[PDB]
Design a protein around this ligand. Structure first.
Ligand SMILES: OC[C@H]1O[C@@H](O[C@@H]2[C@H](O[C@@H]3[C@H](O[C@H]4[C@@H](O)[C@H](O)[C@@H](CO)O[C@H]4O)O[C@H](CO)[C@@H](O)[C@@H]3O)O[C@H](CO)[C@@H](O)[C@@H]2O)[C@@H](O)[C@@H](O)[C@@H]1O
Ligand SMILES: OC[C@H]1O[C@@H](O[C@@H]2[C@H](O[C@H]3[C@@H](O)[C@H](O)[C@@H](CO)O[C@H]3O)O[C@H](CO)[C@@H](O)[C@@H]2O)[C@@H](O)[C@@H](O)[C@@H]1O
Lengths: 298, 297
């Protein structure tokens, strides 16, 4: 079945000692192909991203590439910790573009009380200047994105009421309705502990192609794939049994958080999907999948 | 008359010692407002830009800003020294946008023989990925730009056959015709030694507003202003006698090349012109002019 193919045995982006805001880790990046270029909005921390290392703050950087492998990067974050909901920063952005506007959903980590993390929304026309729209769902939640277009006149979002992937609908992005779970962990497998989306889903002629992540009972993170019905994305057409990507290389297995591959971004150019992923919550790699190779076992 | 007003008493961009390609100087930048942002394509050198320091190489960097004062910058040049005409790099870019395409004219400095510098053209849709189109005029020349639109069906360019500003016309950017001088130095003034354009001209209801630079007989560089006729830009309607900008601050007067202000870029947002300029061939500053204040005596 479906296996992602690494474009490089080295990371495509790494932390930068000279800049405090991204000195420790760059990971879990949004990705989009636009106007002839691959664009990354990447999560970056000043400290290793676990409480055992310290009070890490996540900020969002910008990088750009012609080929999807070799990146140039801006020296300052395009979004920084500004609100109370963002006391400990902004995490794990997912971006789609609808009618000339980029919609980014990210985790605002406050850590003022138990489960003080919230899905937040920001919009942009240019990926540099972001306007905050506030909390999307006022509840402990993350792993969220819009679908890249309206379905039957409505905005559609994926979210993650622990430990399951959920879907919901909205007329205006302000109020959400028709919440329902669509994907759950499976006991005694690689995907037993929890599930959550990767990057935003991608429209194909056979359905919505959605990459997801899961953790096993040792907290090893891997990626998998599902296909959702076009008109009712709450309906799962197919779910591949085996992972599409697992920690294999040294920088996937070792880092601040061991044995993690984790995606928040899948850019598309000429029928090739470029899946960007965090390795060990420390660096960013890329792996590809050609659209024609999206096949689920009949 | 017309005076540019500095937005800051500090530079808006400075060299960055940790990157070789822009370690010593950033200056003489293109500038354009697009999609809610100010964009700079800046000239950068690895060492002080004078022969006494060595064989400096110029490369082109990218910077971006919401407000036109505070910039973020990419870590690598968007264009580097690649051809024989660019042995010593790429200098002094001027950019305009026509029908979704950015046209950048820059100096390719080869230094293989006397006067081995040529106006070259590159195009982009995104300001990051540039496609070389080659030499524009095969002759010693610089200080060049397209006009930001076609006039009577034709591309129009400014150039500088030393020491005068010239104009020329083209159907296709490949062959040029109707070369004519439009602006010359004036003896016993601040603009006695030579003249050349600043950034691309800006369309006004009264004519084409063109910032130019000049050097005096001590090689002090200042900016001035002219107005050209809309339909025949070879015709000068007005020329201000006094400069619009001169070296005054420490980082304009002192640096690798003393007493220089030099512009290759003027971005426009909501009827305000943002004139970016090199100071002392070392750093970049910005000064503004509101359209309503464009008045000639
Ligand atoms: O520094 C002010 C601006 O100078 C021009 O570009 C520089 C250079 O100009 C040529 C010539 O250069 C002299 C001397 O002025 C210069 O300091 C040294 C540097 O090693 O070389 C000398 O030959 O000066 C003439 C008088 O204006 C000028 O017409 C010549 O083109 O040209 C080289 C190659 O193109 C360039 O690297 C230098 O920067 C301007 O075009 C701006 O670039 C400078 O701001
Ligand atoms: O969004 C805030 C932080 O959430 C984290 O995930 C938590 C929770 O984290 C656990 C550990 O798995 C984690 O390594 C350490 C880091 O200090 O904190 C613990 O509380 O794990 C559950 C299950 O996956 C999530 O539902 C929670 O959101 C990480 O994602 C951090 O990166 C993030 O800053």
């Amino acid at each position: 079945g479906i296996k992602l193919k690494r474009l490089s045995d080295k990371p495509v982006l790494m932390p930068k000692a000279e800049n405090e805001w991204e000195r420790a880790a760059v990971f879990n990046t949004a990705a989009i192909y636009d106007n002839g270029l691959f664009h990354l909005i990447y999560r970056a921390t000043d400290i290793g991203p676990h409480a055992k290392y310290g009070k890490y703050i996540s900020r969002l950087g910008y990088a750009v590439s012609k080929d999807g492998i070799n990146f140039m990067r801006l020296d300052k974050p395009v979004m920084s910790n500004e609100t109370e909901q963002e006391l400990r920063g902004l995490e794990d952005p997912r971006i789609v573009k609808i009618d000339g506007i980029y919609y980014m959903m990210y985790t605002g980590f406050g850590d003022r009380f138990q489960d003080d993390y919230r899905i937040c929304l920001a919009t942009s026309k240019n990926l540099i200047d972001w306007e905050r729209k506030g909390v999307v769902l006022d509840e402990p939640n993350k792993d969220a994105s819009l679908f890249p277009e309206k379905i039957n006149g409505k905005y559609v979002m994926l979210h993650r009421r622990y430990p399951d992937i959920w879907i919901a609908f909205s007329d205006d992005l302000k109020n959400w309705y028709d919440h329902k779970p669509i994907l759950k962990p499976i006991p005694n497998t690689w995907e037993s502990a929890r599930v959550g989306i990767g990057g935003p889903p991608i429209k194909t002629k056979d359905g919505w192609f959605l990459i997801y992540h899961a953790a096993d009972d040792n907290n090893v993170y891997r990626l998998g794939a599902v296909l959702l019905d076009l008109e009712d994305p709450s309906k799962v057409i197919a779910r591949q049994k085996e992972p599409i990507l697992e920690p294999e290389l040294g920088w996937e297995k070792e880092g601040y958080i061991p044995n993690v591959v984790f995606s928040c971004g899948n850019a598309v150019k000429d029928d090739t999907i470029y899946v960007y992923y965090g390795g060990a919550d420390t660096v960013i790699g890329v792996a590809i999948l050609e659209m024609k190779d999206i096949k689920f076992h009949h």
